[model samples]
Target chain A: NSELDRLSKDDRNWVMQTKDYSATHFSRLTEINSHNVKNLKVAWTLSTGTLHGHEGAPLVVDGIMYIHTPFPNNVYAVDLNDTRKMLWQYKPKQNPAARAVACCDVVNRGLAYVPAGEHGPAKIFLNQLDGHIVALNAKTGEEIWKMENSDIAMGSTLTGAPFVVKDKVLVGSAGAELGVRGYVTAYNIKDGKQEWRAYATGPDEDLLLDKDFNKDNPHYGQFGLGLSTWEGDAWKIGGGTNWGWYAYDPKLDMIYYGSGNPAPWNETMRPGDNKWTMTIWGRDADTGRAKFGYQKTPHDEWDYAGVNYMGLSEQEVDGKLTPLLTHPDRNGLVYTLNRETGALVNAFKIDDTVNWVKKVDLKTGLPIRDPEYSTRMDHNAKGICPSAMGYHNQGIESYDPDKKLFFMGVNHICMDWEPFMLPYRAGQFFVGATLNMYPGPKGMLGQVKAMNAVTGKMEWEVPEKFAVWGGTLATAGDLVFYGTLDGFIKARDTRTGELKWQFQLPSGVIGHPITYQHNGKQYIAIYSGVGGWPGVGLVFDLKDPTAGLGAVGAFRELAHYTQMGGSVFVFSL
Target chain B: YDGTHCKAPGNCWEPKPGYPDKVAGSKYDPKHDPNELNKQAESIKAMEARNQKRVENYAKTGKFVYKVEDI
Candidate 1:
């Protein structure tokens, strides 16, 4: 209770990855505002000494910033109180072979921080790339407890960050493309014991669904619904891998997250509605029992992984301020659901050229599929908007509580996809589709858009030449900060979406931008490293345009701009 | 069965036996090294060819189509 109370009002230190449990990246620090952001200068920079996709932001608690690297998952505690000195470092030992199973790039999102409470001292929970979860002492960087959550030999790795809720630290498995059955496990923060495990696609018992599950939303209320929706034994390796952001609602006593794409992108093989893949789940935080299940893209044909970041906010709905969960999915729909009842409030497009679904029927909560753009076993699907990247992937959105608007980075890209016959093998890539993605109709690659979540309307957009792979951080200063794929971190007016200031980094940024206050001064920090799915070609220096599944062709100009490196850039006015 | 027989798409980077655990200390000179720069230059050339083909295909069939089997 004391820890939750401490984290709820923690504006000085970024206690959690998403600031607080609300998943709102907006910080209350107003020292760096729109009026003075143009004078922002790089205050200091530190090298992480690893070159991979740095996906998430660092965690700062009590003037100590905990930074993480990609593959080996080295963690360093830098004392910001004293010239950013490296106080202690914890280097983890991971099997190098695990990189083969990581689908896109060798990446690890940042660590989670748990404050000192009844549990020993303060601890930093790290989900390593080789499926190990280690709890380290926040002060001395000593190992508290280590647990093997997932197995690399079984085609499962830990890429996402661990999320701490009370005494349990929650983690999810990745590697959906390797035929691994996805599941989320909660471990005891003190002794590293698995508390509860919930599979994304399985029978009712495996999904932690009881008789009262989804009673409000009748679509997922029936027994054996998960098994009945999938073809025989296919749900075992169904690939509803939960590898993205998660949010917690303490008032409702529920945790929220989304699942990944179905296994084997070929839609012809595993038939029927792939139960929980590409679905959003709301589960009880303690028991892991699902209260609501909302599948956005049923029988997803485009390999649209549903694992995108979702945020919780109270928005005006039906003339009342309703607690709503907003999810911008890979299927191009920004879905807003009533957090209590799991009822669909509104589902609208985040990408302008989304053509796979005609619209979401409110009564049944399903997208009416288009026949022409559907990928099949024999024929190829051409000009499918929102590619596999959908509109946005792991790049998170920030909600401005004052303006009631969502600031997000969206990809304006489309793809040509074809499905083929491929059998699942252990630790092998079960992906049966090949894609050639390019820029969308606008020909420009990306945009940072300001959207009104309640009315489902785009307020304004600032266009960019490349996809904005980094996350947005909205501050009380009325400025929205975001990083670009071309080695630039930019700031824009949160209300009007006008470019205010920008700075170039040493490498392209796929990491999230974070801001915090230490000793009365405010600062903005982000990790600069290239090599996610989009920037894979540049990292490996591959010559073929079709390398990295047409990502090389899509972002070929990135090689001329930046090279492979990892460093943290902090800016201040 | 293992993943040895599967034809993996894209360039997969594998470290040599007992290579440096961290790539940050590893040498990656794409803009400076001749071999690295040539690979990047060739990637741009390859993109130019693909875009040219994309234009012709779109003009002829009103869609950008690429047969995945033919890289």
Candidate 2:
């Protein structure tokens, strides 16, 4: 029987196949609840041959689990009942040289799957960084169909997982950081045909020719305003791409996703609240029309694109239950908004060290800029708290309805930025300009915290050195599971941020985790390998025995394990 | 007198290549000299105008375009 048919109606209702991307990674399968998770143990380990940064979250369907590894963007299927025995593997022939220009880690966040007939077969969809979407047969691991509609030569790329909604396959494009124009496209699941495309820079209009339009155009005849935020025409090349996580609301038929930062990394280039770029937009899933949207960071000077993972939850407001979207943006604030109307219900700074903005303007639902925290124009750069990297990245945040709390991983650090004249190069979107220095006091530290969703207040926190790299998985077992840059896969008490259990892996674990029951036993699984940008850069700088970690040699350590590889590790009790 | 010693403005910067004087002989001895400087200045102006025209063409065409060069 199909996994969908095998479940009871009650179990099916709670199955939450869509929300289970990281569910198995945090399953409360082993009688290990918040009450006794201290007794959990490392049940099994499997080494995936490729290495680099392991950021995949294993997806469990029926008795099988699927995972994606870094850059060549390969997919592996493992039988959950066996010791993660590989049943099938599909390795797409990606442009190997594409890794050289990847703005962030050459990591494929993951893939999305839909049952057979949604497209060609019940298959897994892998969005490769080289701008191709490949569909694989889930059961046999055969290549079904592949779509390469994006302009790779123009620097367009993909990093996030695809979102499968009914007959449409929704996917967001990345590469804004590298000066590529941002966009999201929806493909027909049946024949892999593109349905619609939405640009992040707003509606298509000829502002350069129309005098009235030019007069009304915010930047007006100058790419400088839009380009100033980053380093070059990265704005004309940047904005509005969904590089972060996106979610769907079937009832409203709207897909929600966040837009990335303006390119060039400076605010002087892109002026007038660079619209629709660093904001959240609700789009008609079928038509890809912008239903409603709000800019999270207007005229963002800090390279603080609001792109991050958002979660949907029910909140009691004005004596009524309202569905809301909650996210902790890179701009150092946590926001809760009315998902339907794009109304800002409540927001707050997630960290005490935040100095960029004094407070979120409740009336306007915008950040109140602190001039002192803003980047200086006189070339006298001031040090600002919460570095451009922000408090988080690809890390998943979870909303636990039973506990009425949101779990998130945060980074603490400050940055010193100064403006510089950059020389533009031919055929390059980014001008070689701008300087962002991270002095010792400005480096980042990671922390995992649980917050009261309604009040927008923290309940508990656990601190670490590097930022939490993986997404968070939550379960009714009163537990939340995630991994760190230091290679530790850990579970924390849902209510309290206390570390309940953890196991060290061969490399860092940044992928989403999932949980499922095969026979009568429940299992927890995660992919471990390290090669993402953040982890790879750190791995490159390790000097002493304890400086970072034990390096096999100078700049070359354990080469066999660091070559864009990963393995699915499953646990059972 | 040869009208070769020349200098001109509005020229794009291009570093002139050099070779041994013996190989240059007499006619090309001052290859990287004032005459070359003037030629470079005029070339730069031409390039600037071409670039501006390219942008204008893009505005008119509404198509993605670029200039390609072989290394």
Candidate 3:
């Protein structure tokens, strides 16, 4: 029985299949507390009629839940104990025009489970936006296995969430800014069969042209000294894609993730220090190899991308429990590594309008860029201050360890950028780069700070205007849950951030909000349907007043809702 | 008045060897010549008083003169 005794008697018979994608989505199930989560309501809301932005995170098992949508990658299942019932969905016909190359916003970040009779039929693995990795059948969603894995005609794609473990599922590959080369496979969750694939741009004899160990070798020299920046062979699409969020640590068997950046966002178009593309590897989930890596933005010209979302705690340091991780990249720093030897232990900067590097050299962890915020190759704007739409993405930050804190979901917006000499075709993979963005001068939309993971400081903050796009979870009852894009669902006070309770969610909240317990009824669940890419450029561009008509027709009023959305709600009290 | 004047203005009144000279009261029938209708009504009242003074100097100068009236 032991898998924590078959997940505590299949979670007290409510049968919660499996989830713990680990910490923050904290579902050790403690019967909804902080005094009744404000008499929580809405025990249903299942609209999968397909739209665009609905940032995943459904997957409840036994009573079934599954869900997942974006691009044409459907997959439903419903009936998490009668939330207006369904029990079967599985779409996957795809290619309705590969959604025009999908650079950022046809989102999907959620899905990955294996638990049915142990390995063969509890399925549900997803990862599609055109880059295949199917595997359904978690009690009839059907389609058992598929694979094209990825090579989106060589620009690759697939937006995160797919980390099954034991029987192997892993995933990761996102078009590194139209120049796609990033990797991280590991398939075989019962028949798709891939097993090990690493590659975040290394082979040219593992390039590292030494500007003092290529400034900390995150994967250095991304193919340049001989030119061929993919003209006809298209250097296999140039960048190192690993879209975002990856985590696994079956007690350090590893599988960390992160990697993106090194295409044509113009960091002198592929110069040195582009290795492991924007860094953070830690592989070997079952031989994807790497073992120890960490390059949080070597030559990244502010497209930042440490592939967002990392969080895995355990810390003890001098007494030895170790396993740390933490992350925060989008180039506004906040590291804290050492997840089994990737070292670096502690880094800062959460956002005060980070001017693309003017500090992060804590004895060479690297950043320092700021050549007046660079960019000039026919320059256009270049103001840059945490705005490649970062400061966080697919949000999710946590790490309480009895209030050592770390929380997250901060953004102060600040961008000006211009670089637009675009050309890479096959359905336009984002070329006309513009970004005028705004807000920040302490307008700080959507905060929830709580730092001090061993003295990075801050320790308190709560602001809002739409930023905590869900993902903070915490618990052991000091509480902390999260959710927001301005639709509430809060819970704070995990050591003085205070607020202590909130509820409002009819929409706007992006993934990560769990809590289990069934027959005894404690439930909490979340997955409120906002989409991705900053809630599809800010709540589907302000809920599409016809702008984005057929998904960005001449910039349909600046196309928002990165993708469509779906619901999953679920609550109790 | 056609004393050989055929330089450029669309070969002004060319009538012989390439046909020139014709502008004198537009040749002949001005009420069958009663002094050619008083010399074509004094040359159409002196080209309508020089096109009403270039349409009152282009409605007090918004430019484009060319002898005016193109407004």
Candidate 4:
């Protein structure tokens, strides 16, 4: 596992794209630098041969490229070094019954490479949607150890890739809207066994807080604070799911990850600053203990979930290297946090018309809510900008170390939220509110904004007619790559924000884009499928213009823009 | 109906009554009735009641502890 951490920086093999737990989605490879990138051509294209949204990137090791699809969660192992022949495929029988219970489409976040040694060759890990972490021999595609991690029936699922830190395999659970007690657990790589578990919300005992756990927490995350933050037994069903991406600090021995919003969407149901939800956390990688915790939204009134993948980078602070977590949050705000101490360095709006909170309170690092905008059972909050989807959802970001800029796929969208009383049900969406999102100010749906993290300044932006839902990849080649729902995968000049090249695909893109090299040639890879929150209503034929409160109506025309397709696109020069 | 036509606040994400469930396919189906969606107050109430059952059970048992293989 430590070897994988070393491989994270090796430059030869991109074992971990954002796997090393830093915000730098940058590849130091200058082989495909800006000048020759214009000469780039399609190297090869392999179809996953399924129809739906694909949300995971491919892992190429030794010579094989590994990719997976949604729902059935099929892993296609292709030999990249050869004439792109099939190596082996691993298809796990994911329970079909669990489909309806998933708040979103049955999507898989994908595989994490865990250079295997448990009596086998190198192994690749897949985070099954039904909540099973299966380790397969990378060379042979044989199952090394398969262990169930979450119970999709219990409203807990897996939608993000697991990061293998040292000997511990760290994976999180999804299902906040389904009303789940979210957590991130650590398992032994040698044999699939949990080492320690830290809950996002529940009693202090379940949170596994040590004397040092809450040492840096504002509320200390102890003494029934996690329980008392909610009204009555609301904490039990408090939907602070850890369904998003993760980042880890190797030197600090801390794994950083964000938790989803509180359950039921209605702020009236769960009163008080819902202690742990809508927060970013730092925990002990070895034992799943806590280092420090920071809450961005204190009692998230909107459907803002803290599950967005964060990029990690560092800057010189007071002659010391200050570690900063560059986060493009769902609440339409870009947060540049001091990851070392959970301090807020700068918080500003990078998107349009973000009125939920004027700005994050730098002194406190918690959002100062407008207070009146809080929704109740009988209240239908008006003009809640950034809707429930916020600006971005589950889309990964890229931080350019050379330019000191962050490029991400963002949405300029807002929604009207109406909270209704709902009892928590397992198989049903526990969302206690109805939301209809429309194009925010300027009627622009999505944009790829390039901005400086520490300066809180927008450098340049490319506006789009629809949302940019997929992840981004930045290269030393001075190119930033991202895919949009319009099925346009574009490469832009990282500095001038000028467009270099764009490729129109068959379907929309919801998966992240990754870059890797073999035999001295750099290639760009992205998954094209249409199944995320906005596309869900379109792809599923959910016509009730008001379904999901009005998201379907708002995104009704998306069907015309792109059709459902499941395929993998690989490009080269 | 292959999800061609259904009306009046129906579940658009599911099968069209008698038709089998379509789990994977093309991104868009032109024939789907945009009007066929759900805004049922009754269903929401029933769902909430069903949800409260689990919350009550878990809170009552207070067995919040998780195990290695329990996922």
Task: Give the per-residue lDDT of model 4 (tens digit) for A127-177.
Answer: 888777777788888876665567665666788787888787787878788
When candidate 3 is compared with the true two-chain complex, its DockQ is 0.00
Off by over 4 Å in 1: A1-5, B1-71
Which 10 residues in a row give candidate 4 chain A its minimum summed lDDT?
A214-223
Residue-level lDDT tens digits of model 2 in A1-573? 123323312221212323442222233344547776666566777665666676657666656667677778777876756755789988777776567556556777787777767334677788887777776788999765556644455456788788776687777876554555567777776556566766666334310111221222122122222322222223354445677777766677777778887654544444344555776767777777655566677656677767788788877877789988887888878888777776777878787777777887666454666666776333444667666667666677777776778888777655556644332221234422243423224344678888876687788987766666577778788888877666777888777777778877766677766666666655567777765644544545443431221111212333333333466676654
- Kindly give the stretch of ten consecutive residues in candidate 2 chain A with the minimal lDDT sum: A206-215
lDDT of each residue in A186-251, candidate 1, tens digit only: 877766656788887878887887567668877533456567656556666678888898888888
Tell me the TM-score of chain B in each candidate: 0.42, 0.39, 0.30, 0.33
Q: Relative to the true structure, how large is the alpha-carbon lDDT of every model? A: 0.79, 0.60, 0.58, 0.71
DockQ-based CAPRI category assigned to the predicted complex of candidate 4? incorrect
Best by lDDT: 1
Q: Report the Cα lDDT for residue B24, model 3.
A: 25
Please state the CAPRI-style docking class of candidate 1.
Answer: incorrect
Worst 10 residues of 1 chain A by lDDT: A1-10
TM-score of each: 0.88, 0.77, 0.30, 0.86
Candidate 2 chain B weakest ten by summed lDDT: B1-10
Weakest 10 consecutive residues of candidate 3 chain A by summed lDDT = A545-554
lDDT tens readout by residue for model 2, B1-71: 01111111101111112312121243212122333223322432353344345344544664323341310
Query: What is the model-wide C-alpha lDDT for candidate 2?
Result: 0.60
* lDDT, model 3: 0.58
